[PDB]
Amino acid sequence: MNVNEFSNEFDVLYNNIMSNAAPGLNEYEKSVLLTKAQEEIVKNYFEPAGNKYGKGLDDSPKRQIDFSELIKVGEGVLNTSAPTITFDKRAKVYDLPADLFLVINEAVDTNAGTKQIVPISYSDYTRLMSRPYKEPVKYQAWRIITTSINNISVELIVNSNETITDYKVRYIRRPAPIITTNLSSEYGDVTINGVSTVSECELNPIIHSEILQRAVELAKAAYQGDLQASVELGQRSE
Amino acid sequence: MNVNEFSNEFDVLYNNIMSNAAPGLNEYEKSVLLTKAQEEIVKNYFEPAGNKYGKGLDDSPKRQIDFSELIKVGEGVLNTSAPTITFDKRAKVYDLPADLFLVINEAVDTNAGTKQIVPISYSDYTRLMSRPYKEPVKYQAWRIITTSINNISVELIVNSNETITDYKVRYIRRPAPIITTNLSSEYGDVTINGVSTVSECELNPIIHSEILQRAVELAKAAYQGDLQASVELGQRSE
Amino acid sequence: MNVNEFSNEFDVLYNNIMSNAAPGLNEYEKSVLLTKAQEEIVKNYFEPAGNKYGKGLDDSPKRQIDFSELIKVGEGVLNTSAPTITFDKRAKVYDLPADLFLVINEAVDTNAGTKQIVPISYSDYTRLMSRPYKEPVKYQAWRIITTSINNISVELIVNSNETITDYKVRYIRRPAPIITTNLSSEYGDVTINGVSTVSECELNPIIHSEILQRAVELAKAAYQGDLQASVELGQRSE
Amino acid sequence: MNVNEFSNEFDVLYNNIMLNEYEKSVLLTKAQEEIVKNYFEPAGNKYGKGLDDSPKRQIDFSELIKVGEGVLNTSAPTITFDKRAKVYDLPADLFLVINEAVDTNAGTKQIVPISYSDYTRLMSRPYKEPVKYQAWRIITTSINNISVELIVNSNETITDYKVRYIRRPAPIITTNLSSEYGDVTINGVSTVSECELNPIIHSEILQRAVELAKAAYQGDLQASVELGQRSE
């Protein structure tokens, strides 16, 4: 469904049938609520505990097809542009793509073959570095986030006497906002995520109805406006 | 039941018998609610936890016959049209049909015979690639979604020294909207999913009554219009 | 009970005894509600979890006699009329009868004798095709629904070097609507399922009273007309 | 209605279906000023409806609504009650303000006419600036004109100040007053003056003038005080 259909069925589901009908929502408000509902839905469906099914990214066909249009593959750029201080002397710093929402798969291609990057926790890092070896298992590499400015910088730890040729990252692209109409105005240009032009929902049509329902629920919680509704509907932001 | 019958029995079940009868619903509103009810019903019945029976796509004769008219078989087109970056060096990119709602069965015919495609999760992918072999079992192939624009693109991983001849996908077609009347108007053409012409329900007649009941429930929740009803009836969007 | 008796006892049970009697229902409304009640009753009684007894199609003498008048035996027509794309290279496409509600028994007569068709699920299909043999057990055949337009098309998989002579389907016929009076009018012909003429209930007289009670309950839920009653009485649509 | 029609149909209503023209002019001018106030305030009239509360009220004030710019009062170096207040003079022919906006470098901002109580309340807090799309306004030392302090947010400059207001009505005069009456003026004009208002409210102005005449000529104190209630 295109943006006009988002807005028309938003109006239908919000106030065109309600008995003591409420004021219609302005297009900026509808775009804001739709973008919020989109992000909430993405976060709810990525995490199993966030939805009533207990199903995350790839726990069912529907969850695969939900994020299928939001998956992207890119590469981390070696961060030798400027000097820096790494926590580990034997780690190579890489910069992830700017439009990164969530990392789901990483791999590094070295001279000793491809290796799956395992994101190790800080307590896990301490445990592993208290051991005599201090290097990954055969077909794996280690990873920790380092000092990041304006984009995520990442330290890749591989086994000794190994060089990294490329660093691929299969991630979830940051969703683009849903903007119903050109938000340009003479009184001031308002933006949802830095863009005023019309922006279609760049995800699969399977969850457009879900985004619409969530947006309507958020609109009605805003209309109710007491602390109660804000608190319970803020639980699903996550 | 054709579209006229959808609308007439919608009117019967909505406001023609109700004591303090409500305003009749316009045909655009009825078409919108019917399309929403259709999608909600499809998602509820595909997933066992979404309905009170706990029965999914093929858990009973009724669930088979429900989606029987919505199943389609097509092929993935090899994506050598333009270059791209694949997460796996040894994966062939294929494009699924545009009108895809849910994938239920995939198979690939290679020079070594037909092989069932197993959609592997990202954590499952990492586990499998940490192993020495890194290839499917005998009569199977692996699959992961890759960078997709305007349609789902898919990476097929098969065993070494194997070529893919065709890639069949048994999926669930995207339901067409239910539109009662030609939505063309002089004041502006409104569309449900990009189509203004009359559109019959293209599913089996077994669930037409179910779609009608769901549409009436959604209409009455819209009429009630408080946050409560929107929140509980948004649970079954799923 | 004929249609006049359906309508007269509908009036008796609806508003002729109720103290603050409601408006009488028009014959189109009574026919619509009776058809809805008929379909609801059929779906409730076919499935054990849908009724309070936990008894399905053949779990008791009453359930047998309920559908006894709605069972039909027909044949699937070989779909060599036009080309198509089958998911399985070794499957023969057949078209089921148009007036099919639910399949309860299938059998195929081959040159190697009669074989019971087992409807295999998609996950079951993947499991079976990951095995070395990939063919049914001795006295059975496999079946999956394929691309269907306007009627269910079915793929029959039998063992190698076997030809199918006929494909019998014992199913439940689609119930005909209950229409009390000729719905022809000068202001517009209204139909329940494409028919305006009088239509008797074509099921056993054992469940006519049940259909009447359900229709009256639906009428009173429509009269009450709030979201509550619609939601709880929509649970038994199923 | 032309002024001749006003004078002639005053005689029909006041002289029992048929006063000096100066006296008629005085009452008609007084009547319109009453009618404008009564139909502006919702509580002043019988319907409980103010300026924009119905289609009739919108056409009533339609020909009085005027849009003008305020001019910076940089000529006189007076003293403002607020540090960041820019003094602006309003139009001379101003009766009632209904919308004010200020065009800053940051953007147009709707001016809120802030009461003396709200100022002390909002200026007793940490930040002490308006909300991001509004400006405050309080009247200041005014000489034969209206001067307003525009308290816009600091770090911003005012480039424009538009005022939408009700223009002061012109007098209704039915004859050249200097012809028979020496130097009498109604609001500084001695010559024939037409009604500058929509014809919809001419009847109510005429009816009010007739009531004012009859109460004035009856001479009873009760009548004078009773009909003086509607003077505001």
Numbering used by the authors:
A (entry chain E), B (entry chain E), C (entry chain E): 1 to 238
D (entry chain F): 1 to 18, 25 to 238
Cite, word for word, the article reporting this structure.
Virus ΦcrAss001 (Kehishuvirus primarius) was the first representative of this order to be isolated in pure culture from human faecal samples. Here, we present the characterization of ΦcrAss001 using cryo-electron microscopy (cryo-EM), enabling de novo structure building and elucidation of functions for around 1,440 protein subunits constituting the virion, leading to the identification of a novel ‘crass fold’ in the distal part of the tail. The virion possesses a short non-contractile tail extending approximately 44 nm from an icosahedral capsid. The extended tail barrel formed by widely conserved paralogous ring proteins has a high capacity for storage of cargo proteins alongside the capsid cargo zone, ensuring that the proteins required for the initial stages of crassvirus infection are carried inside virions and delivered to the host cell.
The barrel was reconstructed by imposing C12 symmetry to a resolution of 3.20 Å, and with C6 symmetry to a resolution of 3.30 Å. The barrel is composed of five stacked dodecameric ‘rings’, termed ring 1 (R1, at the portal end) to ring 5 (R5, at the muzzle end). These structures are formed by four paralogous ring proteins: R1, R2 and R3 are encoded by genes gp43, gp40 and gp35, respectively, whereas R4 and R5 are both encoded by gp34. The ring proteins share highly similar folds and consist of two domains, with three structurally conserved α-helices and a β-sandwich domain. R1 and R2 form an interface for interaction with the tail fibre docking hubs, which are the point of attachment of the tail fibre appendages. The tail hub (TH) proteins form a continuous ‘collar’ around the tail barrel. Each hub assembly is an A2B trimer that consists of two copies of THA (gp38) and one copy of the smaller protein THB (gp39). The C-terminal segment of THB, residues 67–107, extends into the neighbouring hub, resulting in continuous interlocking ring of 12 docking hubs around the barrel. Each docking hub, in turn, interacts with the trimeric tail fibre protein gp22, accommodating its N-terminal residues 1–26. Unexpectedly, well-defined density at the inner surface of R1 and R2 of the tail barrel corresponds to 12 copies of an additional α-helical segment of the same protein, gp45 (residues 214–245).
